[PDB]
Amino acid sequence: DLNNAYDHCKNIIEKHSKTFSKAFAMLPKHQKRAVWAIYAFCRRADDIVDEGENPKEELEAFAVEFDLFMEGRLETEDPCWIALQDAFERFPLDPAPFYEMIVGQRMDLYPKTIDTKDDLLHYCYHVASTVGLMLLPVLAPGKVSRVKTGAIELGYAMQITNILRDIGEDLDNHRIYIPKQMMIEYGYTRTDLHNKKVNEAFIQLWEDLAQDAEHYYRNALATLPEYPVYSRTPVGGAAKMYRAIIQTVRNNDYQVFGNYVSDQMKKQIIAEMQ
């Protein structure tokens, strides 16, 4: 039944994201469950590309499942698809950003170099802003057009934050999301990055991206009054909690070659939102 299939998706979000489970547990019942289902879609697709043994074939098999899903002919016992089917039934979810999300996951299948900041935003749009777009009909039922730009920019904001915390982790998987033009601008070589060096040039480049993330966070938060009241604390809380990763890395002297917002800090952000 629906409660079991949603409970499965609740287990996924609570296992993989402390920040987003605590934010979204504050939504009303049916919005919260739909976000759980939307989350499990995103998290499966990202796990295929980033952690599956055969990512080209697994993701293509995942997208075919979604084509069948969207045509209402996917018949299965998989709780995530049963939860998503109700969510799509219960709220006017748009499939466009769901597809766009898969197009973004495709980008991580083969070697790519981010050259410019726009390259970076293009990537961030497809793997993170799309998720913002998937959620808006649940979060802002009648006001999607009024809040869409801020949702997109909140996407940029959090993906850059995640990239900025995961520099070493991404290097060890032979991924670089730092724009090459910035590395040239600040004199931070690939040899420097290979030697996991935190010098003044690295900090300059990190801070330049971090301030971009911060402007986007600010834009997104400026749209929070346009959300319905029940969405303001979960959306605002999730943003501030994730934004707090940046300052965490600052207080740890930018050591991103070995970072969590603390549980207590997370609660402080929530309480301030309340």
Gap between the Cα atoms of 153 and 128, Å rounded: 9
142 contributes a contact to a second copy by CB under 8 A: no
User: With CB cut-offs between 5 and 8 Å by kind, which of Mg ion, ligand GST, a second copy, none does residue 187 bind?
Assistant: a second copy
162 contributes a contact to ligand GST by CB under 6 A: yes
**Min. distance of Cβ 224 from Mg ion in angstroms?**
25
Asked whether residue 46 is marked as a ligand-binding residue, the answer is yes
User: Reduced to 3 states, what is the DSSP secondary structure of residue 112?
Assistant: coil
DSSP state of 260: -
**One residue of 71, 111, 229, 264 binding a second copy per CB under 8 A:** 111
Give the amino acid at 66. Answer: F
How many residues of this chain interact with a second copy, rule: CB under 8 A?
Answer: 26
User: With CB cut-offs between 5 and 8 Å by kind, which of ligand GST, Mg ion, a second copy, none does residue 180 bind?
Assistant: a second copy
Q: Considering all CA atoms of the chain, what is the largest pairwise distance in Å, rounded to the nearest integer?
A: 57
User: Reduced to 3 states, what is the DSSP secondary structure of residue 258?
Assistant: coil
Pick the closer one to a second copy by CB: 117 or 232: 117
**One residue of 3, 4, 28, 56 binding a second copy per CB under 8 A:** 56
Tokens of 85: 């089917």
CB crowding 179-201: b at 16 or more within 10 Å, else e: beebbeebebeeeebeeeebeeb
Gap between the Cα atoms of 169 and 228, Å rounded: 37
29 contributes a contact to a second copy by CB under 8 A: no
Binding site per annotation, positions: 46, 50, 108, 162, 166
Annotated binding residues for Mg(2+) = 46, 50, 108, 162, 166
